[PDB]
Design an enzyme around this catalytic site. Structure first.
Site, PDB file in Angstrom:
ATOM      1  N   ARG A  54       0.678  -1.238  -0.091  1.00  0.00           N
ATOM      2  CA  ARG A  54       0.072  -0.043   0.099  1.00  0.00           C
ATOM      3  C   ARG A  54       0.736   1.217  -0.027  1.00  0.00           C
ATOM      4  NH1 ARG A  54      -0.853  -4.091   2.360  1.00  0.00           N
ATOM      5  NH2 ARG A  54      -2.792  -4.916   1.988  1.00  0.00           N
ATOM      6  N   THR A  55       1.545   1.548   1.017  1.00  0.00           N
ATOM      7  CA  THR A  55       2.550   2.738   1.053  1.00  0.00           C
ATOM      8  C   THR A  55       2.974   3.037  -0.304  1.00  0.00           C
ATOM      9  OG1 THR A  55       2.321   2.483   3.274  1.00  0.00           O
ATOM     10  CG2 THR A  55       3.900   4.086   2.515  1.00  0.00           C
ATOM     11  N   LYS A  84      27.881  -2.144  -2.379  1.00  0.00           N
ATOM     12  CA  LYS A  84      29.290  -1.811  -2.190  1.00  0.00           C
ATOM     13  C   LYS A  84      29.360  -1.108  -0.820  1.00  0.00           C
ATOM     14  CE  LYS A  84      29.457  -0.825  -7.114  1.00  0.00           C
ATOM     15  NZ  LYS A  84      28.817   0.213  -8.210  1.00  0.00           N
ATOM     16  N   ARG A 105      11.072   4.778   3.018  1.00  0.00           N
ATOM     17  CA  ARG A 105      10.860   3.718   4.109  1.00  0.00           C
ATOM     18  C   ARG A 105      12.279   2.921   4.379  1.00  0.00           C
ATOM     19  NH1 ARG A 105       5.630  -0.540   4.202  1.00  0.00           N
ATOM     20  NH2 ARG A 105       4.791   1.566   4.985  1.00  0.00           N
ATOM     21  N   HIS A 134       4.978   6.837  11.165  1.00  0.00           N
ATOM     22  CA  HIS A 134       4.196   6.703   9.893  1.00  0.00           C
ATOM     23  C   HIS A 134       3.219   7.535   9.643  1.00  0.00           C
ATOM     24  CE1 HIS A 134       3.094   4.535   6.414  1.00  0.00           C
ATOM     25  NE2 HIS A 134       2.682   3.201   6.889  1.00  0.00           N
TER      26      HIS A 134
HETATM   27  O1  PAL Z   1       2.803  -3.391   8.605  1.00  0.00           O
HETATM   28  C1  PAL Z   1       1.750  -3.046   9.089  1.00  0.00           C
HETATM   29  O2  PAL Z   1       1.565  -3.995  10.123  1.00  0.00           O
HETATM   30  C2  PAL Z   1       1.359  -1.652   9.192  1.00  0.00           C
HETATM   31  C3  PAL Z   1       1.918  -0.569   8.135  1.00  0.00           C
HETATM   32  N1  PAL Z   1       1.656  -1.115   6.853  1.00  0.00           N
HETATM   33  C4  PAL Z   1       1.114  -0.467   5.734  1.00  0.00           C
HETATM   34  O3  PAL Z   1       1.832   0.920   5.821  1.00  0.00           O
HETATM   35  C5  PAL Z   1       0.994  -0.975   4.592  1.00  0.00           C
HETATM   36  P1  PAL Z   1       2.152  -1.753   3.709  1.00  0.00           P
HETATM   37  O4  PAL Z   1       3.253  -2.345   4.471  1.00  0.00           O
HETATM   38  O5  PAL Z   1       1.829  -2.505   2.371  1.00  0.00           O
HETATM   39  O6  PAL Z   1       3.019  -0.526   2.722  1.00  0.00           O
HETATM   40  C6  PAL Z   1       3.488  -0.494   8.466  1.00  0.00           C
HETATM   41  O7  PAL Z   1       3.825  -0.268   9.490  1.00  0.00           O
HETATM   42  O8  PAL Z   1       4.137  -0.853   7.391  1.00  0.00           O
END
Ligand code: PAL
Ligand code: PAL
Ligand code: PAL
Ligand code: ZN
Ligand code: ZN
Lengths: 310, 146, 146, 310, 310
Positions: A54-55, A84, A105, A134
């Site tokens: 999703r993100t 590297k 991320r 987040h």
């Molecule tokens: O992973 C989850 O349980 C919560 C949350 N999830 C989401 O953001 C959706 P995703 O990991 O698909 O991007 C995150 O903290 O990564």
């Protein structure tokens, strides 16, 4: 200029109720009136050092929908950091000489913040940092509660699951504590309880919260049931007792729920939410997901374009 | 007495067994200049104070404040030709930079070449330390590694 | 004089920047008895000295032997009733127990519950330390180094 | 009591020329007139923490030729040290309550000295400890020289290969400098030179030694050409340059050789001794191995018997 | 015939107080006046399917002290059971056609009972089966208590550590409840408590037992402080919380101790017994190990000899 114009979005802790509302008003505007070339000619980096569905996809669809271009990685193994041994500081250092913004991320807490230190005038947007923050998640969450409850004040909020490592609840709790007359019910195994630092602020802001040992001692009085997944990849062995969802929701537990009451979940869900719930009208997690498009669109628009949207 | 300087600084009243600690952390002893340390000395109010005296050196306000973490009872005497020109008492600083280490093993802070940084906050008993990076807040007790 | 005590030990002629090290290694600070430390005090000979004073305390038999290795110039003065009752200078022992760490990474010394022990041999260029376990010989320069 | 009666045989540095002489005299004696029951009613532990073909089987063969029993391991992986996390100090403390002598080969230098501190009254025999010592190899080596040359003095010895990690040549060098007039010639890649601690000793004892770039430059004057295998398993990665043998012996290089000259090798050999050398009368490494039986039989008999009348 | 003549020693639950007494009497006897040939002409199989240092070497040492021969394995990996897919039933069927007694240690509970069904006339001795039983440890343990306390009755025994997976304390508990007036004190992490099946037994037999949160609360009244290692290899992941030892003994905690009090430990010890305890007169775990020789020598002599006249 717009308040968020060219600002980093690293933690909910740094945004004011004002910042929040702006994003939500903008989101609503764009949901209604799309701007296909709002970011025409921008190139945003989509840098994922950790898993995502999703993100990442939702962030990339939003860039595309506003006319922006996207470069990036969804895995760090084929990056020079991967093979590297380059530091992340060097990585944000060069990447920030190519794009107009960095979405990122990372598995370590504070990676987003460290990048702000090496990116120059290039804003950094936190798609999640270890188990810290987040922020763009809190945004679509906020957009959904308002959409479904009609307000952000005088809400009864239950947060079940892994509150210790769920960067999603850290962020959302600090978001709603910024509103008034919100009431918190925290349901978690004691090994995965809500961080102290978060309660301390609830206390000071004089906000009310309680711990419950069952979804059912709070069902009849919640507006929002915010379920979460056990951050299985964050635990240390000492916590392996807790791998399995201690709190599972079935369509059946939704027997005493108010009729406005919605079940949210950042996703993904393992077993904490059985599939029979998907059918009940309280199930709002797929809708919740879908909104990521509007909130993530409103954010980019604000951060990369001086002037307020139409 | 103990040893008098013509110029420099005197850190009087360093609670017993903290005189050593501070000589460590704020690296006060990495100079080609005269330091005079007296450990375990008295004077009514509290039976054994540590006094540290650095000559041809003056502490700032930032540096002086950091000291508040270890010795909130201290007194920095600013000497400019034999007698005590300036006198400051430590006050909880806004943040402590570079001296401490984040106890969060997963802080990006450990891996990368940044300076540690903590925001110092007052609770009740202790001082809570909040990592600039991982945003986790610790107790002054735990930050200091064991 | 410079810091007369009644009965205690006094180490003088400590190579600069070693005064602090010794205050640490020896365990001099885990005491309740008045200590006086003078850092970056001048010496007519090789240029600067550190001097430590401990009240009502005498230096262990080994402790003065470890000095040999570290401050091979140090002079240990004994005092009683403000008098220099005895004056010793460190001499290289034959073997150093449990303070040194064998530079040989594959030594059993590291993995198992034993105390390190080295045989001392004053050469012509440096001191040679021999690991009792591995039998490899090293230059005290390598053993003692950080 | 004999001098060796209940002594720990850890390092050749701990035995005198007489000690060495008592073992060859006895070895010489058991070889001609066997004693099937000197060690009748003794249980010896054979503890190999590192691979061995020759050192362990010759010792165990030697143990049985003399009527003793054997218990032990050839793999530390099934001990409680390998699987339950037990230290060597504790291993040796309990095995020493069961047996009469302990033969041990270990990967870390000084492993055998440490055992002497936990064994009490039980003699520990060092079958090799890392790249430190190999005293029992040196006894069968001295026995072989003596037997083919008739003396242990005034010899011209060449040591080739890995001198650095060669626990075998560390022991032999110290053993022959105990005799008069021995002249050493060391041929080794620079990275694998003889430790200085040994060189310092020849120097003190004013023994004549020299370094050579080739075998051939000394071929016409050695009595013994002692080859060694490159300790592949001990090398540091920087030394991977040296994995292959720099000096290889072939039948053809024995052209110049004195008639009495013998080629010894602790074994196993990789590529350093071509197999054509095997058919020449210089090749003595398989008779050298065989002699491990008489030298190890003689050492066990002295440590464990107060008086040996043969 | 003696009572133990050709019996299978599988579980302590299958032997009576007299059976136990016959082994300590005999153990006591072999200790003073050795018999180098009771088992002359017997071949015993030593089959270790799980790691062992003490249990296997003491048994094999014991076998040789008594003149018997040994065949077996310390690693099931090279058997045809490890590589060709053979069951244990078939393994035991054929090994039982070769040998006179079979000593076996296995990872699964009940492995030794199953062998009794395939061995025919051949006695099977259980050197440990999973977290079930360890009868031969219990014989050397009883022998050690008796010897240091002078009785097996009216003692005050404390068992500390992993009581759940401790095959050692499962056997010892059943052995001492066979004697009169023993009082038990169990100290263990909750996750690692003593199985209820044993507790049900003390209760039936109306034996006094208690649970304690600390060693120290019972320090001044135990005769025996029986420490155990956390069975790391048996734990379930939920129990990884417990991997580290909760109760650690240090010289300093022996301050209060009765003068006669002894610290026993089946061994190996990880971090539960600090090494400073080793120098106190309470430390008796290395003498306890040594006693495995006399107790295992006495058991082999009874199973295999119809009449023992010593
Ligand atoms: O992973 C989850 O349980 C919560 C949350 N999830 C989401 O953001 C959706 P995703 O990991 O698909 O991007 C995150 O903290 O990564
Ligand atoms: O390994 C060699 O090259 C030399 C020497 N070899 C031997 O002892 C023969 P083995 O390994 O069969 O016992 C060693 O030091 O172990
Ligand atoms: O493993 C232990 O902690 C206890 C006990 N240990 C022993 O028998 C000693 P060993 O594993 O050397 O035979 C076990 O049950 O196997
Ligand atoms: Zn941090
Ligand atoms: Zn060493």
């Amino acid at each position: 200029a717009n308040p968020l114009y060219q600002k980093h979005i690293i933690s909910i802790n740094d945004l004011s109720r004002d910042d929040l509302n702006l994003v939500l008003a903008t989101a609503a505007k764009l949901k209604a009136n799309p701007q296909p070339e709002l970011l025409k000619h921008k190139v945003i980096a989509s840098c994922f050092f950790e898993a995502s569905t999703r993100t990442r996809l939702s962030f990339q669809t939003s860039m595309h929908r506003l006319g922006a271009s996207v470069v990036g990685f969804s895995d760090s193994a084929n990056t020079s950091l991967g093979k590297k041994g380059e530091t992340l500081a060097d990585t944000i250092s060069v990447i920030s000489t190519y794009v107009d913004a960095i979405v990122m991320r990372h598995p370590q807490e504070g990676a987003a913040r460290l990048a702000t230190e090496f990116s120059g005038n290039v804003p950094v947007l936190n798609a999640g940092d270890g188990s810290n923050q987040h922020p763009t998640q809190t945004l679509l969450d906020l957009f959904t509660i308002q959409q479904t409850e009609g307000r952000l004040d005088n809400l009864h909020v239950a947060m079940v699951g892994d509150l210790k490592y769920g960067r999603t609840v850290h962020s959302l709790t600090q978001a709603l504590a910024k509103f008034d007359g919100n009431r918190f019910y925290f349901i978690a195994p004691d090994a995965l309880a809500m961080p102290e630092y978060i309660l301390d602020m609830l206390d000071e802001k004089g906000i009310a919260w309680s711990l419950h040992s069952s979804i059912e001692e709070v069902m009849a009085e919640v507006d929002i049931l915010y379920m979460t997944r056990v951050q299985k990849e964050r635990l240390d062995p000492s916590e392996y007792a807790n791998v399995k969802a201690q709190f599972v929701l079935r369509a059946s537990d939704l027997h005493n729920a108010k009729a406005n009451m919605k079940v949210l979940h950042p996703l993904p869900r393992v077993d904490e939410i059985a599939t029979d719930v998907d059918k009940t009208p309280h199930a709002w997690y797929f809708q919740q997901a879908g909104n990521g498009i509007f909130a993530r669109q409103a954010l980019l628009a604000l951060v990369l374009n001086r002037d307020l949207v139409l | 007495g103990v040893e008098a300087i013509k110029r420099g600084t005197v850190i009087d009243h360093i609670p017993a067994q903290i005189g050593f600690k501070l000589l460590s952390l704020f690296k006060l002893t990495e100079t080609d200049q005269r330091i005079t340390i007296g450990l375990n000395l008295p004077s009514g109010e509290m039976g054994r104070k540590d006094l540290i005296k650095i000559e041809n050196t003056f502490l700032s306000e930032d540096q002086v404040d950091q000291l508040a973490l270890y010795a909130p009872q201290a007194t920095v005497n600013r000497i400019d030709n034999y007698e005590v020109v300036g006198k400051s008492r430590p006050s909880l600083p806004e943040r402590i930079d570079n001296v401490l280490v984040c106890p969060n093993s997963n802080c990006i802070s450990h891996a990368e070449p940044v300076s540690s940084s903590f925001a110092v906050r007052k609770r009740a008993n202790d001082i809570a330390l909040k990592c600039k990076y991982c945003e986790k807040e610790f107790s002054h007790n735990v930050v200091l590694a064991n």
